[PDB]
Amino acid sequence: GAMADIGSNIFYAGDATKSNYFRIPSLLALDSGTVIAAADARYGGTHDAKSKINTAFAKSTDGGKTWGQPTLPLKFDDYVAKNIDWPRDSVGKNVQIQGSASYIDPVLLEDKETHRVFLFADMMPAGIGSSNASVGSGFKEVDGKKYLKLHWKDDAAGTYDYSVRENGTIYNDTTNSATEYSVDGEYNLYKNGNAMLCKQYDYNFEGTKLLETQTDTDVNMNVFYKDADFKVFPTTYLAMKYSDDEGETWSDLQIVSTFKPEESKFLVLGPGVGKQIANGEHAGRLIVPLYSKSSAELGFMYSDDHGNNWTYVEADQNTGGATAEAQIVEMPDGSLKTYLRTGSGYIAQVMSTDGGETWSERVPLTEIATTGYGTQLSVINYSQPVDGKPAILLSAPNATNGRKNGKIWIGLISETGNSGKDKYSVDWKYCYSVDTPQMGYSYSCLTELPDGEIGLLYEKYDSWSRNELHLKNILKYERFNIDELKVQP
Ligand SMILES: CC(=O)N[C@H]1[C@H]([C@H](O)[C@H](O)CO)OC(C(=O)O)=C[C@@H]1O
């Protein structure tokens, strides 16, 4: 590493998370000027769920120069957290953990009006990922009210005759009566006040066979575990916790996806950051991007009451479930521009003028090359004029073959003198090269730091490639002043 690369790891193999791998960066400068970050702690190599993944978290007091020890605010204990070197061979490289619960794909958001920070992540029951989730919400309605549904072990497959109700009281819905079972605030199970338990799994390889085997370590039976007496419906959930103390402590787990459409296979987070509206009618609205295999592809969830309640909105009617990972910026009036990945070989743009309730048709973004499968991007507002215009920054790879050639772009915003969603034009005038064209570059998250420097946490390899799986120390942190970035190639 060069002098300039010292301090370019936040999460790394050997830190406190006990993970050898990390993916999916999230980076956010708070209003106070503290800076926080989050990423997947991918234990079982860099595979997506299904796997064993927890959400990692760290922060910087010194404006993002330096980072504290990492924490695990969203974590499951059904399989142990350990440092294991995943095989990289033609056969083994493909092997993933079949039986663990996971948190995956974080989003960080701050309510600046209340100084509350929210952490969201997809919540996967045991052995589930987006690809093998079932169709359904995971909740039932009982006398008009939504309750998380549960399968008792000795009931017929696909039979969910129970529900978590007030106080975590588990009810039998056939007779509508409380049982002796309940869940606590962690969704761990109890029988007549007594903690239920089960044996934690280990995983070790013998050659290219992955051996997932019980140990003699008791952990709390959780409804998200493979070996629980009561089990949630095996679809994708959204989880959130909040902190008022900049991530020093976290609130209780919230399964917020009560709005998951019954017709959807998965509904998951567009990783990166969310947005608080600063200007206009809907100023103060909190909004978080989502995408799904459902009635719609792109969606959002928003709160007009500082995080207590969340409303789901569909931005299109595509049923094909392409990976429409999005990030959102604000126009100076306060309308929203969203930039998103697609599976159609380009990055797309959409506008909303009603605070994200409705959205315009997708518009391709010509200026940036990408692959057919696409990659996640990061877009943000910059607080300062740039050549005397309001500006945004976008980070994304810039190649048609592979995830590589990452750029940071500066877009300059103009009024076109037209009306509505067309009020504004973005001029992508600057294009900064992060490394070289053949260097790998995948997911990324920008933030503007306190001093007005631009921070970047990114995947410095190609995370799609089947030949770059299970690499360590690929998650890189760099800082730039705004003049560095003003390049015109
Ligand atoms: C929830 C989940 O799996 N998210 C993953 C997403 C997904 O795998 C798929 O592309 C669409 O269903 O893709 C990628 C990726 O590197 O492309 C990373 C995410 O971690």
Residue numbers in the entry: 235 to 723
From the article:
Neu5Ac2en (IC50 of 1.4 mM) bound to RgNanH active site in a half-boat conformation, planar around the C2. Most protein–inhibitor interactions were similar to those observed with 2,7-anhydro-Neu5Ac, including the carboxylic acid group to the arginine triad, hydroxyl O4 to Arg276 and Asp339, and those made by the N-acetyl group. Neu5Ac2en, an analogue of Neu5Ac dehydrated at C2, is a general sialidase inhibitor that inhibits both viral and bacterial sialidases, including the hydrolytic sialidase expressed by B. thetaiotaomicron.
RgNanH catalytic domain (residues 243–723) was heterologously expressed and purified, and the crystal structure of the N-domain with the inserted I-domain (NI-domain) was solved to a maximum resolution of 1.71 Å. RgNanH active site presents the classical features of bacterial sialidases, shared by hydrolytic and trans-sialidases.
